[PDB]
Design a protein around this ligand. Structure first.
Ligand SMILES: Nc1nc2c(ncn2[C@@H]2O[C@H](COP(=O)(O)OP(=O)(O)NP(=O)(O)O)[C@@H](O)[C@H]2O)c(=O)[nH]1
Ligand SMILES: Nc1nc2c(ncn2[C@@H]2O[C@H](COP(=O)(O)OP(=O)(O)NP(=O)(O)O)[C@@H](O)[C@H]2O)c(=O)[nH]1
Ligand SMILES: [Mg+2]
Ligand SMILES: [Mg+2]
Lengths: 165, 196, 193, 165
C-alpha cells in the first residue's frame, strides 16, 4: 500500500524514458537523451510508484548509485538490437546488484525493442546478462516494445503482484 | 573554504527556491479549486437559464444563447481543470519528491560535517593537552578516527555536489515543460471559447 | 364570480413563480461574481510570484516571464468583467427586489380587499335567509351599504392590479433584454481580451 | 441614510428618460417613448435613490397615480421649447399635487432643453405652471439640459439638501 520506488536503468538508447511515459500515460511520447534523470509519480493497478528514470550515457552511469537508496524494484532496459554493447550492459548489471542499498530490490529486465526483426532472443540476452547466475534474488526478463506497447503490461503485472507479496 | 561556502550557498538557493515552488503550488491548487467552483456554478447557471428559455418564450433567445455560453464554458473549464491539476501533480513531484531526495543527502552531509569537526576538535586537544605514558596510545586512535570522518565528509561533500548538478539539470527541464504546458492550456481555453 | 379574477389569480401565480426563478439567477450570479473575485486575487498573486521568480532565475526567466504577463493580464480583464457582472446583479436586483415588489405591495392590498369583500358578502346572505324582526329589515340595508362599499374597494384594486401587471411585463422585458444582452456581451468581451 | 423613492413626471418628449440615465451613468443615451415605466437605483452624494421614470404619452398619464405610493420627491420635467403645450403641462401638474399619497413629496421642476436657442427663461415657465401660487409645498425650479449636463448637480444637491432636513 505504500508509495514504492522504481529505478529505470540501462545504457543510452535502450528505451528507458519511453518506458516511463508509457507507464505514465499509456502512450509513446517524444524524448530527448536524459541528462541526469526524469522522475514521475505513476499508478498501476492501485499501487503508487515513484519512478526514477536515469540516463544511460557513459558519463552519467558512475552516478546511478547516488539514487539507489530505498529502491523496491529495478527495471533493467536492454536494447535487443545491440549485440556489440550487451557486454557493457552486463558490466553495469553486475556492478549495481553488488550494492547493498539494493539488496531487497526486485529486478525486472526489459529486453526492449523486440518489435524489430533482427532482435535477440530472450535466451541470448539472459546468458549475456548472466541472469541464470542470480540466486537469492527475484527477477524476470520480459520481451518488450516501448514504441509498440507489447510486453509492457505483462511485465508490470508481474512487477506489481510480486511487490505486493 | 570557498569550495565549502560555495556549497552552502547552493543549498541556500535550493532552500529558497523550494519555498517559492511551494507558494506557486499553493496558489496553483487554490486556482484549481476556484475554477472547479466557478465551473459547478456555470453548470447550474447554464441549466437555470435554459429552463427560463423554454418555459418563457417572451424571451427565449435572450435566455437561449446565454445558457449555450454557460454550458460551453463548463466543458472548457473542465478540460482546463485537468491541465492545471496535471501541473499541480508534476510540480508536487519536483518539489516534494525530487527536491527532498537531494535534501536528504544535504542532511547527511551536514551530519557528517558535525562528526568531522568533533573528531578534529578532539585530535588537536590531545595535541595541545597534558602528557603522560598513555597519551600516544589514544593519539593514534584520534588520528585514524579523524582520518575516517574526514573521508566520510569528503564522500558526502562529493554526493551533494553531484545531486545539486543533477538536480539543476532536471529542475530546468521540468519547470520549462511544466510552465509552457500550463501556459498553452490557458491559451487553448480562451481560444477554445473564442471559436464559439 | 367574474372571469377577471380567475384570469388574474392565474397571472399572480405566474409572477410569484418567475420571481423565485430570478432570485435563483440572482443568487447564482452573485456566487459567480464572488468566484471571479477570488480568481483575480489569486491570479494577481500568481502573476507576482511568476514575475519574481522570473527576475531571480536567469536560467528560466523567459518561462516565468511570459507566464507572469498572462496572469497579470487575465486579472486586469477579470477586474473589468467583474464590474459588468456586478452591474448585471444590481439591475436585475432592482427589477426583482424593488420593481416587482412594488406590484406585490398592490397584489396584497387587492387580496385584503377581496377577503373583506367575501366576509361582507356572507353577512348579506346570512341575513337574507334568516329570521325576521325589528332588527332584520333595518339590518339588511346597512349590510348592503357595507357590501357595496367593499365591492368598490375590491373593484378598484382589481383594476389597479391589471394596470401594474401590464406595465410590469413591458418593463420586465426591457430590463431583461438589456441585461441578458449586456451580460452576454461582457462574457465575450472578456475572452476578446 | 434610508433609500428614497423618486418619480420623474412630465409630458411626452420632455426629456424624462434622458435625465434618468444621465443621473445614473452621466451619459446621453438613445431613447424611445416609455410605454410604462423605467426604474434604476441611483447613488448621488452617498444617498441611494429608487428612481422611477413614467412615460408622458396621454395613454399612460392617468395611470401615474398608480405608482404614487411612498414617493419622497417628484421631479417634474417640462420642455422649455414647447410653448404650445405648457397649458397641458400645468393642468396635469396641478391634478397631481391634489393627490394625497404625495403629501410629503418635494416638488422639483426641471426646465429642460435650455441648451436650445429659443429656450424659455426660467421666469416665464415658473409663472405659467403656477409655482408661486402654491400653498404648503416646498418647490424649486432649475434650468437644465440632459444633453449638455447643465443644472443637474445643483438640482440634485438642492434635492438632497431638502430630504436631509
Ligand atoms: N523500434 C523501437 N524503438 C524504440 C523502442 N523503445 C525506444 N525506441 C526508440 O529509442 C529512442 C531512444 O529512447 P529513449 O527512451 O529516449 O532512450 P533512453 O533509454 O531514455 N536513453 P537515455 O539513456 O539516453 O535517456 C527513441 O527514438 C525511441 O523512438 C522500442 O521498443 N522499439
Ligand atoms: N436639446 C435637448 N434635447 C433633449 C433634452 N432632453 C431630451 N431631448 C431630446 O428629446 C428626446 C426624447 O427624450 P426622452 O427623455 O426620451 O423623453 P421622455 O420624456 O422620456 N419621453 P416619454 O415621456 O414619451 O417617455 C431625446 O432623444 C432628445 O432628442 C435636452 O435637455 N436638450
Ligand atoms: Mg532517457
Ligand atoms: Mg421616455
Amino acid at each position: 500500500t505504500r508509495e514504492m520506488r522504481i529505478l529505470i536503468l540501462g545504457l543510452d538508447g535502450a528505451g528507458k524514458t519511453t518506458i516511463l511515459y508509457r507507464l505514465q500515460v499509456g502512450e509513446v511520447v517524444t524524448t530527448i537523451p536524459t541528462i541526469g534523470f526524469n522522475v514521475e509519480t505513476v499508478t498501476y493497478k492501485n499501487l503508487k510508484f515513484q519512478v526514477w528514470d536515469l540516463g544511460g550515457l557513459t558519463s552519467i552511469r558512475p552516478y546511478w548509485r547516488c539514487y539507489y537508496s530505498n529502491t523496491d524494484a529495478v527495471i533493467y532496459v536492454v536494447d535487443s538490437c545491440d549485440r556489440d554493447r550487451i557486454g557493457i550492459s552486463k558490466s553495469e548489471l553486475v556492478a549495481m546488484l553488488e550494492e547493498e542499498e539494493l539488496r531487497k530490490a526486485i529486478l525486472v529486465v526489459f529486453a526492449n525493442k523486440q518489435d524489430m526483426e533482427q532482435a535477440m532472443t530472450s535466451s541470448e540476452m539472459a546468458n549475456s546478462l548472466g541472469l541464470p547466475a542470480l540466486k537469492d534474488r527475484k527477477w524476470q526478463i520480459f520481451k518488450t516494445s516501448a514504441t509498440k506497447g507489447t510486453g509492457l503490461d505483462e511485465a508490470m503485472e508481474w512487477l506489481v503482484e510480486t511487490l505486493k507479496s | 573554504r570557498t569550495v565549502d561556502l560555495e556549497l552552502e550557498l547552493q543549498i541556500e538557493l535550493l532552500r529558497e527556491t523550494k519555498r517559492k515552488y511551494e507558494s506557486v503550488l499553493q496558489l496553483g491548487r487554490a486556482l484549481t479549486a476556484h475554477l472547479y467552483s466557478l465551473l459547478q456554478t456555470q453548470h447550474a447557471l447554464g441549466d437555470a437559464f435554459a429552463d427560463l428559455s423554454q418555459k418563457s418564450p417572451e424571451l427565449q433567445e435572450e435566455f437561449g444563447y446565454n445558457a449555450e455560453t454557460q454550458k460551453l464554458l463548463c466543458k472548457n473549464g473542465e478540460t482546463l481543470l485537468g491541465a492545471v491539476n496535471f501541473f499541480v501533480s508534476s510540480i508536487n513531484t519536483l518539489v516534494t519528491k525530487t527536491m527532498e531526495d537531494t535534501l536528504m543527502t544535504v542532511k547527511q552531509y551536514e551530519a557528517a560535517r558535525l562528526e568531522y569537526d568533533a573528531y578534529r576538535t578532539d585530535l588537536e586537544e590531545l595535541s595541545l593537552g597534558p602528557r603522560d605514558a598513555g597519551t600516544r596510545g589514544r593519539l593514534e586512535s584520534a588520528q585514524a578516527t579523524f582520518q575516517a570522518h574526514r573521508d566520510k565528509y569528503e564522500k558526502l561533500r562529493g554526493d551533494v555536489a553531484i545531486k545539486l548538478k543533477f538536480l539543476e539539470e532536471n529542475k530546468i527541464k521540468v519547470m520549462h515543460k511544466q510552465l509552457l504546458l500550463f501556459h498553452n492550456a490557458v491559451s487553448a481555453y480562451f481560444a477554445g471559447n473564442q471559436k464559439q
